[PDB]
Symmetry: C5
Subunit: 205 residues, 5 copies
């Protein structure tokens, strides 16, 4: 602990916080979903509720250190409030997202940060058909709220949503779940926007 205390002190107290990316200085955030459960479906409001882990990865120069200088410490855990985090948001939620997990990130010597909040999300989705055999399809985009693709580049490692943790006895079985990077384009504005479209196909039972 002697060493880790010093490391944390050097990174967080001697330095101002990282002010977020700029166009001259962009950042890549890697996003990945582990879909845990579809909890609730509401025919009368068209909200559906998901529980998932949202994996977030990025890398900052200002978070790098030589392990040799800190008793061979390769990585540590720290409160998410101690560091900058990206403003990744569901574009079509209907309630504030509920955080199910401690807000703690893992920081590695190479400057990598990994942050994996578990969340319950209510979002817009017409479940009409979910009792049929062919099921229904819903979609929610995740993106930075205020950063364009010039400042924050979104990325996935795979378009397969991780289903290895899906609640086996959920009221709803998952037929397919994909996470797809998209580049929104508008004649409002001569610059791109990046989101990840979480598309879930599911049915009852």
């Amino acid at each position: 602990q002697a060493n880790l205390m010093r490391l944390k002190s050097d990174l967080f107290n001697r330095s101002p916080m990282y002010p977020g990316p700029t166009k001259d200085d962009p950042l890549t955030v890697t996003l990945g979903f582990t879909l845990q459960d579809i909890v609730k479906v509401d025919s009368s409001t068209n909200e559906v509720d998901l529980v998932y882990y949202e994996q977030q990865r990025w890398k900052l120069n200002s978070l790098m250190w030589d392990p040799n200088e800190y008793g061979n410490i390769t990585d540590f855990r720290t409160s998410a409030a101690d560091i900058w985090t990206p403003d990744i948001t569901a574009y079509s939620s209907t309630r504030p997202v509920q955080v199910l997990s401690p807000q703690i990130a893992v920081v590695t010597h190479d400057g990598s940060v990994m942050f994996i909040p578990a969340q319950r999300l209510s979002f817009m989705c017409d479940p009409t058909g979910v009792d049929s055999e062919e099921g229904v399809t819903c979609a929610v985009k995740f993106g930075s709220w205020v950063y364009s693709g010039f400042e924050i580049d979104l990325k996935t490692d795979t378009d397969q949503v991780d289903l290895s943790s899906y609640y086996a006895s959920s009221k709803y079985e998952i037929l397919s779940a994909t996470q797809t990077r998209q580049v929104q384009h508008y004649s409002c504005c001569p610059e791109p926007y990046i989101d990840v479209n979480l598309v879930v196909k599911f049915r009852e039972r």
Copy 2:
């Protein structure tokens, strides 16, 4: 980031916060709504739930900078807690407004601030009739809570509410949505009050 850190430092640490407008020193706030979804109607309580983005714009001299002096930075993003924000409020909500988006603002070198929170709002509205053609109409005024028109002047760029992001599969289709600036007077009160009246006409299906 070298430059942005210094810029934020110069603006926010060396200076006291902006103390809000005065009558000798008023401020114009521009308001605009992007209506996302009418989520829920409650006929027994006459309450209706909206999800929308509320675009807010204003301009402060104390937030200006010459880009040349900060590595050609034209704008940045910052926590809304870092700056003064107007106290725009729904005049007839029945529950505290739920914030759906990160509280982050965009500040431009000319001193412009842009803040676009996503919100869910329950407000007073008698939905009786919504199951027809011709549908039902509901209104809600948004205004400063404590500043008169002498201190804060409200404005819109257009009386058309932005409907380009309305949930196509909402339980409710929008017939029309306007945002209209009103000045009120009141027997009690020498000074003018300004609001923007959000009027939405909608029906089921």
Copy 3:
């Protein structure tokens, strides 16, 4: 803003906060209600929900200033957390009060403070009869929770609750609404106890 910043600095940063009234040094708070809507009734728990504005006024010597010394500023707005506020509470609520408005007060050069929070309140009342023509009476008292009438004297400008903003299409029409100052005593104790009794008579439709 040059002057207001100085004024706020002089009042709030050079001075300790006001520590609340004492018996040798009492305070008068003026209370008034603007009743906005009766939202819901629950005949199964006997709770009713009101939305109202609660007008609070009091005056502190420590909040006075000569406008001439601060560029003719007569009054300003500030976060309620910057100043002492009285602990006015509903004596018979069943849920924590929900705050519907920004917590901002108006301070005037004469030492007056005006604070007008919008609130939603669930309180004990038995609505049995509300479907009749002659309606039903509910009452809730509000006073200080911890100050006796030796320290805080409550007062109203009028016993008429302001009904000029009542939701015209509420499920409940208001037959009468009064706000009445009351002094009780307790055996054990010389000190008088003050409250304002909000009595509301209402019926369906």
Copy 4:
């Protein structure tokens, strides 16, 4: 206010906070309940909701002063966060306790503290029979969560729960309410444990 500011300063800023009682240095806390309302019973979960005021009294040497040295001030009010408070807890709640009143205490020159939070509490309780003639009896203990009877001695002034404020039109009439100090010995532990057992007998109507 001149004197009170100084008194508060002397007690709270020049001194560390009181660290809580020890076995060599125990503390008596006096508890009393004012039962305001039984809001609901839930027969499908065995939860029952109470609204009450829980009077708490204790006495600390470190909170004493000679009134003569502070302009004859006998007592003052202060935020409960300014002082140590005992960790009195319902042993069988099913939801976090909801605070209904400002968190302010009254401190007297003799070192007495009085703290009276109003709360809504959902506890365990099988209401089966509450519609019958004799109705039912639920109980909930209150006691320190982490201090044994060697550190915190609980006490009541009376075993009668104060019913003088019970909502006359509650859905439930109170047949009897007692508060009884229990010295419990657990077979895990050599220390004695105290609690106050709030026993309420009630029925419908």
Copy 5:
């Protein structure tokens, strides 16, 4: 109190907080559950609510002291915010956990910390069958959210969940309740994660 104040000062003010364990410096946390009540099931959403005490024990060198140097004080109580706590989390909750008890820990001279928060948890569980005699079996996993088994080793004293406080009149009787230590080797990674699998078999009545 003279001595305790000094002890707390020496431990918490002169020293930085404990920065959490590292692989070169791991920590054992001992977990144990006291199951208090199964409160509610929702066969519609497949969620189940438990109330339990979660006993947590660990030991830190930095929390040791010689009782002789502090007036023979063997142990003390302190706010859990004053010390590091492990990030033990339910892996399959569907709502944020509700804390029912004061957040206070007991620290012993040997460096032991004991922390026993009472909680209400809604987690994923298909109750279909609970009305039979055989009953239904449900399972929830608890463990660190961000520390691998290289940093935090979980342990139980017993695989028997403590049932000596179970609500005798709960809607649900407990047929069996076990807490079992597991080693899991999830998706991405070469490093184990440790969990305690809380398995509860129950039925109505």
